[PDB]
Amino acid sequence: VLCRESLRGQAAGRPLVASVSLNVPAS
Amino acid sequence: VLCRESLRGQAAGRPLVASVSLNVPAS
Amino acid sequence: QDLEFTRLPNGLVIASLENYAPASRIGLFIKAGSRYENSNNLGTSHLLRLASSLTTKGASSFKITRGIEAVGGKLSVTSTRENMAYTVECLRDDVDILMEFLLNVTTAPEFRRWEVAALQPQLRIDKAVALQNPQAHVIENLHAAAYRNALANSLYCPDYRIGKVTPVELHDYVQNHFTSARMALIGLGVSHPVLKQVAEQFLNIRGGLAKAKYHGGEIREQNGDSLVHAALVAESAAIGSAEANAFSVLQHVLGAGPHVKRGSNATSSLYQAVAKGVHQPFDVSAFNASYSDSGLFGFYTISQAASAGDVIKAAYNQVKTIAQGNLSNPDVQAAKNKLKAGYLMSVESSEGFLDEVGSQALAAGSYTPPSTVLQQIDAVADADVINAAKKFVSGRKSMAASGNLGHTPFIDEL
Amino acid sequence: QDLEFTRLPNGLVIASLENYAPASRIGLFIKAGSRYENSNNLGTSHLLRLASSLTTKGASSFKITRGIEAVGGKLSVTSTRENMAYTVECLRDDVDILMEFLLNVTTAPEFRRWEVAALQPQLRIDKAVALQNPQAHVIENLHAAAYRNALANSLYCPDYRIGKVTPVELHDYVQNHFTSARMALIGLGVSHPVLKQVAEQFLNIRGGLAKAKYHGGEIREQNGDSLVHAALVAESAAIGSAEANAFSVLQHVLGAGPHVKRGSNATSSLYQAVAKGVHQPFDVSAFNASYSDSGLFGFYTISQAASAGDVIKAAYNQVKTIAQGNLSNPDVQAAKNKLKAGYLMSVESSEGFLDEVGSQALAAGSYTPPSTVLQQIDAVADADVINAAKKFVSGRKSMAASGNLGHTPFIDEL
């Protein structure tokens, strides 16, 4: 990341939700 | 460690001193 | 085209909605999140999340994977601090086959020694990937700093435990927390009589069952990222309190993130507050977490390493403004419209709706239609918002950071 | 048979003692410990400790090792938070050869790119071995919890930096901290005129040069050791204050460790205090650290995991007793005899004496004979001891623990 534009939307406001699957990648 | 006897003398009272050498093992 | 909801004698909630769509989607939600681990079985619910295609009483490890894939399926498992959720999607003609799978995985896993042994390194992989997103660093530490007990637990197994979660522990966790009393069986695209039927026979698991104590703390992680993440929170309010809605609105006043690609965020208090002085890459957002029995409220910065002092202060100050009165109705209107809009949008999908209906089924015991929710958001007073801000500034602080923390302040540096 | 001591114009202290022994032992002590790292070069002094046989201007990496071994030599490097010390031992006929080496390593290392690159993984080895002793966990965390700046730094490079310490950084560290002003050249078994000579020519390094701010904190490390280590400290007193001697005596009242193999420690306040109730494996000792500009004083427990609450409380209470008056002269006499005896014994050897004389040369600027020290220990009042105990109970606490911390309390649980 080298710019405000790209950086913005990273600041977290979701308490985290871990999701893992069978045939869909984890997130 | 399975006994007071062996356990005692572990409680620390020396702030730590790292010593490494040329031909003597580190401590 | 209406949500049907029932509760069994034994406490199990069932919600469905026949929308006669081509796709059917069933969730089994469970009060079984990371909060329910103690200091002795840390990481177990993580392994349990990773373990859903291990052999069950009813179907082999092979049969789960092949059977679900046969029909274009998806089986998936989500955890928060408070809940776990097992979701199956498919074409409507095959829900029978997927329900069979869902019931197997949750009702009778075997957790064979060799399979569990074998799955252990996945803990490290899944964890390692997760910790790539530095938000996860900060947020997991934050919870650990803030609480002393349940909500303190991270969702990802601690290193010392990878290799060391046992079959017995997996069993205990399921037997103790997957009980009729603590489940909600949610169903979009299926008949509610048939969900009742299924739950009556197959989810009859005999009910086999501390308040989260916020203490406040501070956790620093030195590396050299040269961008510093920091979160600063105070105790908030639990879900279901009208206080909770107050915080949510304050979040949207201060600004919880961007509405426009490449946006300047003209409307975000926090963003403009920082930006009046620091003119380089940064990001800032209000953080709001509301749990059964507690909540965290505050803001999260991403700043240059050198600038973190200047950014965190600028951000904190903005909240002090709200707390000391300075909040127009223009601002609070904007906030509510945002929250109202964002809520309705978050339930636009199958995914989102299922998560909401199941979420509520556990947390309250009921469904709140979106209209009523919006009323409750409209029902918040600017006085309530100023109070929520007041509560943060004055409340005992928890903080977590990570980065090159050279110019990152400690709590006691304000 | 007397210690000779001189200071150059340029600040370099020289102490020697011709004891006409068969072995000669030279130390070059340097105000260059871990405290002098900033958040940007963390771990550099660790690498620097490991690096002493890398190529210098005067002798190859090969020549240092072969040359020293030729004559039965030893070259060795010690760090604390505040100092580093380069020591050479040999037979007296060959000090010439070893001085040559000592001067090379400290005066003109080259820190070639390829050698430094190559030494990097040693950081991990040396660190990994060190962290085997769980005392190191607790004590390094403890310092990190207690301070915000220098004394906070661990002596072992942090993981994120292993691989990443540069030649340039090694150079800066040496050039900036190995200056005539900040060195002491100590010498047992050699002529003081010859040490002066050497130091005048070869240690003429132009003087190329924050107070440690104790804040107080708490650091927990979850694993499953089933034995819990914990240290609890309050700010203490810096070296050279008579307060310092007060704490040292309080340490020996409370009990700093065993005088008898398999001992019951009839005379250790702390030990008997714990043991009156908890009758299983444990250990406890007063912890005392006194630095240039600060100090930590408290106690360290090793308890069963389940028992840590009960042990830490029992221990803390014992200090409260001293603080609220309860200290006989019998007890304080015992304490002083211990400290007096232990001091004299700690300088019985070549090793110990050299370390003491060099230690003092940096810290004050002078030599204090053992007799004067004992006077200063005799000169402490039981009132001073009760004050030191008072200071701990009332002072702001820092704590570090590690183990299965399920029943280990937070500071704010007393």
Side-chain angles (χ1 to χ4, degrees), chain A, chain B, chain C residues 1-389 391-413, chain D residues 1-389 391-413:
Chain A
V1 261
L2 302 184
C3 77
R4 183 189 318 249
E5 272 86 347
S6 59
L7 191 49
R8 214 305 183 228
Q10 288 301 286
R14 35 251 54 257
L16 263 325
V17 211
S19 215
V20 329
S21 189
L22 192 72
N23 58 337
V24 154
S27 43
Chain B
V1 261
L2 302 184
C3 77
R4 183 189 318 249
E5 272 86 347
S6 59
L7 191 49
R8 214 305 183 228
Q10 288 301 286
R14 35 251 54 257
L16 263 325
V17 211
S19 215
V20 329
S21 189
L22 192 72
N23 58 337
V24 154
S27 43
Chain C
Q1 318 131 233
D2 264 324
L3 188 81
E4 307 178 67
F5 187 131
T6 68
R7 142 143 36 203
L8 295 190
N10 67 16
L12 185 275
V13 170
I14 308 168
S16 84
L17 167 59
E18 185 50 279
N19 58 3
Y20 283 122
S24 302
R25 180 188 200 107
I26 295 160
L28 181 61
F29 294 69
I30 306 179
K31 301 162 203 270
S34 71
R35 78 168 300 131
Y36 297 106
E37 304 186 346
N38 53 81
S39 91
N40 286 314
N41 61 352
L42 289 172
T44 298
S45 68
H46 176 191
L47 187 57
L48 183 60
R49 177 166 81 250
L50 283 173
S52 42
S53 66
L54 300 186
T55 292
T56 68
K57 279 231 143 79
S60 57
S61 175
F62 179 82
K63 185 146 108 76
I64 297 167
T65 300
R66 279 284 172 103
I68 292 173
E69 281 197 307
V71 299
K74 184 187 175 189
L75 158 71
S76 40
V77 180
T78 320
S79 296
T80 53
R81 275 176 170 76
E82 309 212 291
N83 303 318
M84 293 178 73
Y86 286 70
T87 325
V88 286
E89 311 137 62
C90 57
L91 283 191
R92 72 178 296 120
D93 282 300
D94 308 297
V95 281
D96 301 331
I97 314 150
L98 271 79
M99 190 80 227
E100 184 149 341
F101 292 150
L102 172 56
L103 284 172
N104 268 303
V105 312
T106 40
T107 295
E110 299 188 331
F111 299 137
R112 310 182 157 176
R113 169 172 56 66
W114 43 93
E115 286 168 18
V116 161
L119 172 63
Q120 291 277 339
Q122 192 48 37
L123 278 167
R124 190 156 16 247
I125 295 197
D126 170 65
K127 179 172 165 166
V129 170
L131 296 179
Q132 278 195 285
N133 317 289
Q135 299 78 354
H137 287 271
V138 178
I139 298 308
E140 299 283 86
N141 288 334
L142 180 72
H143 281 82
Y147 297 89
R148 72 209 332 167
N149 43 335
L151 295 184
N153 297 338
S154 158
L155 290 162
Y156 305 113
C157 179
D159 295 326
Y160 81 91
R161 280 280 288 175
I162 298 166
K164 298 206 308 198
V165 181
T166 71
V168 177
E169 290 190 308
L170 286 173
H171 278 291
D172 288 347
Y173 199 90
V174 170
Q175 163 212 291
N176 286 321
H177 296 109
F178 284 36
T179 68
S180 292
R182 33 203 306 158
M183 306 194 304
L185 179 66
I186 316 307
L188 198 51
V190 52
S191 96
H192 190 85
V194 164
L195 277 195
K196 265 175 89 302
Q197 177 76 348
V198 176
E200 270 153 13
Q201 305 187 57
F202 279 64
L203 297 183
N204 202 19
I205 350 269
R206 255 183 262 112
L209 294 169
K211 295 286 299 305
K213 280 148 283 175
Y214 178 96
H215 84 109
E218 195 173 352
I219 290 182
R220 292 185 148 242
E221 207 189 67
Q222 186 65 2
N223 63 43
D225 280 350
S226 90
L227 273 61
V228 161
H229 295 210
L232 183 59
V233 305
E235 197 167 10
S236 195
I239 41 134
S241 69
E243 197 168 16
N245 304 123
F247 273 110
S248 307
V249 165
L250 170 62
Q251 161 170 47
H252 291 263
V253 179
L254 281 174
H259 282 250
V260 179
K261 183 165 207 202
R262 309 219 157 82
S264 73
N265 312 294
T267 337
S268 166
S269 303
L270 274 180
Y271 198 95
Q272 294 306 127
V274 175
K276 284 198 177 86
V278 184
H279 299 263
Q280 289 216 318
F282 81 87
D283 175 52
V284 61
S285 159
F287 182 90
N288 185 38
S290 192
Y291 304 95
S292 72
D293 65 0
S294 190
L296 305 179
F297 174 92
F299 64 84
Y300 188 122
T301 83
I302 289 165
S303 40
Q304 292 293 309
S307 282
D310 299 349
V311 172
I312 298 164
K313 286 178 173 184
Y316 188 26
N317 276 355
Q318 181 52 33
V319 193
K320 299 160 83 78
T321 269
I322 307 278
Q324 300 154 346
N326 298 104
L327 173 59
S328 67
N329 259 79
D331 293 345
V332 176
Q333 281 308 315
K336 288 186 177 182
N337 281 355
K338 283 163 185 172
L339 177 64
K340 284 188 300 187
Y343 172 78
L344 302 164
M345 288 192 263
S346 70
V347 301
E348 265 179 22
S349 44
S350 279
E351 201 296 296
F353 182 70
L354 196 80
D355 196 42
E356 179 65 44
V357 161
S359 189
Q360 286 194 227
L362 298 170
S366 48
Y367 180 54
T368 304
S371 47
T372 284
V373 176
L374 302 206
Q375 288 166 15
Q376 290 167 10
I377 297 163
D378 285 307
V380 175
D382 307 25
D384 282 313
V385 168
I386 301 186
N387 278 355
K391 191 164 149 99
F392 167 82
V393 175
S394 71
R396 186 173 162 75
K397 293 294 193 305
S398 305
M399 197 203 194
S402 76
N404 182 25
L405 302 181
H407 291 260
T408 302
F410 294 74
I411 277 183
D412 66 68
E413 308 178 3
Chain D
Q1 318 131 233
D2 264 324
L3 188 81
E4 307 178 67
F5 187 131
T6 68
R7 142 143 36 203
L8 295 190
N10 67 16
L12 185 275
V13 170
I14 308 168
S16 84
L17 167 59
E18 185 50 279
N19 58 3
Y20 283 122
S24 302
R25 180 188 200 107
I26 295 160
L28 181 61
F29 294 69
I30 306 179
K31 301 162 203 270
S34 71
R35 78 168 300 131
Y36 297 106
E37 304 186 346
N38 53 81
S39 91
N40 286 314
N41 61 352
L42 289 172
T44 298
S45 69
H46 176 191
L47 187 57
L48 183 60
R49 177 166 81 250
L50 283 173
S52 42
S53 66
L54 300 186
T55 292
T56 68
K57 279 231 143 79
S60 57
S61 175
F62 179 82
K63 185 146 108 76
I64 297 167
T65 300
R66 279 284 172 103
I68 292 173
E69 281 197 307
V71 299
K74 184 187 175 189
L75 158 71
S76 40
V77 180
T78 320
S79 296
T80 53
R81 275 176 170 76
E82 309 212 291
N83 303 318
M84 293 178 73
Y86 286 70
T87 325
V88 286
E89 311 137 62
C90 57
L91 283 191
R92 72 178 296 120
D93 282 300
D94 308 297
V95 281
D96 301 331
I97 314 150
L98 271 79
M99 190 80 227
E100 184 149 341
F101 292 150
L102 172 56
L103 284 172
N104 268 303
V105 312
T106 40
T107 295
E110 299 188 331
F111 299 137
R112 310 182 157 176
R113 169 172 56 66
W114 43 93
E115 286 168 18
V116 161
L119 172 63
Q120 291 277 339
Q122 192 48 37
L123 278 167
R124 190 156 16 247
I125 295 197
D126 170 65
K127 179 172 165 166
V129 170
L131 296 179
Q132 278 195 285
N133 317 289
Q135 299 78 354
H137 287 271
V138 178
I139 298 308
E140 299 283 86
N141 288 334
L142 180 72
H143 281 82
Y147 297 89
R148 72 209 332 167
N149 43 335
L151 295 184
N153 297 338
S154 158
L155 290 162
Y156 305 113
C157 179
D159 295 326
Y160 81 91
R161 280 280 288 175
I162 298 166
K164 298 206 308 198
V165 181
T166 71
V168 177
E169 290 190 308
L170 286 173
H171 278 291
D172 288 347
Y173 199 90
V174 170
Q175 163 212 291
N176 286 321
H177 296 109
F178 284 36
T179 68
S180 292
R182 33 203 306 158
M183 306 194 304
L185 179 66
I186 316 307
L188 198 51
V190 53
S191 96
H192 190 85
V194 164
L195 277 195
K196 265 175 89 302
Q197 177 76 348
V198 176
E200 270 153 13
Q201 305 187 57
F202 279 64
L203 297 183
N204 202 19
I205 350 269
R206 255 183 262 112
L209 294 169
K211 295 286 299 305
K213 280 148 283 175
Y214 178 96
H215 84 109
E218 195 173 352
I219 290 182
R220 292 185 148 242
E221 207 189 67
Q222 186 65 2
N223 63 43
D225 280 350
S226 90
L227 273 61
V228 161
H229 295 210
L232 183 59
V233 305
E235 197 167 10
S236 195
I239 41 134
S241 69
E243 197 168 16
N245 304 123
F247 273 110
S248 307
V249 165
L250 170 62
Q251 161 170 47
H252 291 263
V253 179
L254 281 174
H259 282 250
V260 179
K261 183 165 207 202
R262 309 219 157 82
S264 73
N265 312 294
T267 337
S268 166
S269 303
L270 274 180
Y271 198 95
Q272 294 306 127
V274 175
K276 284 198 177 86
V278 184
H279 299 263
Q280 289 216 318
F282 81 87
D283 175 52
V284 61
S285 159
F287 182 90
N288 185 38
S290 192
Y291 304 95
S292 72
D293 65 0
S294 190
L296 305 179
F297 174 92
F299 64 84
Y300 188 122
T301 83
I302 289 165
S303 40
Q304 292 293 309
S307 282
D310 299 349
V311 172
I312 298 164
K313 286 178 173 184
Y316 188 26
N317 276 355
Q318 181 52 33
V319 193
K320 299 160 83 78
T321 269
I322 307 278
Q324 300 154 346
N326 298 104
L327 173 59
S328 67
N329 259 79
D331 293 345
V332 176
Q333 281 308 315
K336 288 186 177 182
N337 281 355
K338 283 163 185 172
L339 177 64
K340 284 188 300 187
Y343 172 78
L344 302 164
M345 288 192 263
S346 70
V347 301
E348 265 179 22
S349 44
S350 279
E351 201 296 296
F353 182 70
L354 196 80
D355 196 42
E356 179 65 44
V357 161
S359 189
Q360 286 194 227
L362 298 170
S366 48
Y367 180 54
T368 304
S371 47
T372 284
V373 176
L374 302 206
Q375 288 166 15
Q376 290 167 10
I377 297 163
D378 285 307
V380 175
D382 307 25
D384 282 313
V385 168
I386 301 186
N387 278 355
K391 191 164 149 99
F392 167 82
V393 175
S394 71
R396 186 173 162 75
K397 293 294 193 305
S398 305
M399 197 203 194
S402 76
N404 182 25
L405 302 181
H407 291 260
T408 302
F410 294 74
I411 277 183
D412 66 68
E413 308 178 3

